[PDB]
Write a structure and sequence with these properties.
This is part of a larger assembly, with chains A (about 150 residues), B (about 60 residues) and C (about 110 residues).
Chain A: H1 18-25, H2 33-50, H3 55-66, E1 70-75, E2 82-87, H4 90-108, H5 113-125, H6 131-144
Antiparallel strand pairs in A: 1-2
Chain B: H1 4-7, H2 18-24, H3 34-37, H4 41-56
Chain C: E1 5-10, E2 15-21, E3 25-30, H1 45-59, E4 66-72, H2 78-87, E5 91-97
Parallel strand pairs in C: 1-4, 4-5
Antiparallel strand pairs in C: 1-2, 2-3
Classes of the chains: A mainly alpha (about 150), B mainly alpha (about 60), C alpha/beta (about 110).
The structure holds one RNA strand of 327 nucleotides.
PDB class: ribosome
Keywords: single particle cryo-EM, ATPase
Entry title: Cryo-EM structure of the ABCF protein VmlR bound to the Bacillus subtilis ribosome
Chain lengths: ~150, ~60, ~110
Amino acid sequence: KGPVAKRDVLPDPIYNSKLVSRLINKMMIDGKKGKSQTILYKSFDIIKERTGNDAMEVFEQALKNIMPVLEVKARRVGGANYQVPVEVRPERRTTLGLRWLVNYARLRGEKTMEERLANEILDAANNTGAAVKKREDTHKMAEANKAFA
Amino acid sequence: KVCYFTSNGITHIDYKDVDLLKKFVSERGKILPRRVTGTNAKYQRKLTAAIKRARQMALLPYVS
Amino acid sequence: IESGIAHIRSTFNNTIVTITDTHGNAISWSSAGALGFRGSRKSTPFAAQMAAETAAKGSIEHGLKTLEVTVKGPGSGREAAIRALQAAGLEVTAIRDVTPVPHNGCRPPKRRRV
RNA sequence: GAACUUGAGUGCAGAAGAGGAGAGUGGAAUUCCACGUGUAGCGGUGAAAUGCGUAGAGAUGUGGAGGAACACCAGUGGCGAAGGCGACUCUCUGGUCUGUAACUGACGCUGAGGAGCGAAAGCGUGGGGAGCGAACAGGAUUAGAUACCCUGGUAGUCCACGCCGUAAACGAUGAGUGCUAAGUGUUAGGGGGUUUCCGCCCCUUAGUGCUGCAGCUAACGCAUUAAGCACUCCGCCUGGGGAGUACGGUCGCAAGACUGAAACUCAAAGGAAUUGACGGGGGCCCGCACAAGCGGUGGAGCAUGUGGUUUAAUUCGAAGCAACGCG
């Protein structure tokens, strides 16, 4: 079998980043990159406006707050259901951060996902936020089950 | 291995030889088996009899 | 005091560590269940590490610094508890691996699946 | 009737052995007890709970009591007819093996019936009770759980004597003897070729393992420790069930043991080995199989197909995957 790897497209016409196009490919509903690019640039323009910074640094700061160090996988021996803590390799750190941004942004509920994703980035920047519930709860699950490694 | 008692020609092991028995007894206090000390069957039997009698006169330990 | 002996008793459920005084006077004690783990997590060597940490914290009041650790009971948490006494500010000099060995003695209770 | 010494045994000399019986002693540990340390748990499980615990437990130090088995030696090692026998010492005592040459000179072997020994459980009497532990109680799992799991715990396990006299009491292989390739460990001897030795080699016993030739066998395998080739003696089998039953008898405090059918019933029961399939057996591998994800179905409305039911007919065909927007 063995591991297979994938690719992704380098630029964005505003905000020339790899990972911002990685978020563009994320949150795509039904094969519509156009709607996700419009939502994304209107959200990052809100993040540039409402806080007087470039939204790249706010976005990476939010990522740094969300990216979990420790997943806790499963290892069932007998009838035990043990969970085993896993040091996450940083690709999965970035992709779990992007899933949690996208999922809890559209799960929040405001008068566009422009505003929802923008306010979720603004909350994950000033660390208290909705995806950071998942960050904290995964680190608490790894902290309690640290006896197995 | 090689036997000790065949080498020095010595017969009945004579419990009074506390230093020789102290050589055969292990570090914790146990008797070392025949594949460690290299003796015969007969000489290992007389060795273990010797060590048990010398234990009952406190010439040899039980536990250390 | 400055010197004492650390009795670790790690059995298949619990790893109880009591740091006592040389003619047997317990300065402080903590178990794997005393730390809070109630389930099967009592058996993990992390709880033995935590129990050695708490016993080390309790021992350094009126105090003591250089231990002499006696491993008792057939378990798992002996190595982590010896290492965790070192990393909690104490010194572990001798290691007496003394589990109570009967020669022949009493007969054990029956094997389990029968 | 007379001789002989090989078979058998005595004599002398060693050697090894948990061979047995009686008495005495030891060291761990388990439990219990008292005191010091000290505080909130302990214990246990797949998960928990009953239990133990602030009235001070679990841990720990010292001391004491009591019972039972004797770690390491320990080994397809030893001994015994078998059961069996593992600390040590003494008292008495059984057998074996080795070297012969001193003796006897066939004195030998087997053995129905008889006599004895005879694991464990059980029985009687008196003690004993630490651990374990039927029965029994509580908690769990569970549809049920008179079970497995956990916490307790009676008889018993222990000792003295008496009874029972049974086991997969097994090497599933009666005892004796002779003959019939080897290799190799090992247990206890003996002897040789150099070395006083150490040690190596060789030879020979008696015991004990494995691999192996002829031979045997249905095959697996055994093979000088035979399941080979022979002789002696004994026990036992003559299809499965009924049935080790019933009756009678002997023994037994009892439980039961031994001896032991028939009516009836079946055309099989069975052994060893092959090919498959299966395993809540092991290994290795692979598939959107699992995981990692994305979107759904199951909820609502309708389309469509199928089961039931109503029918005059609701035409017939498909029915787990592999029928059900199928012909």
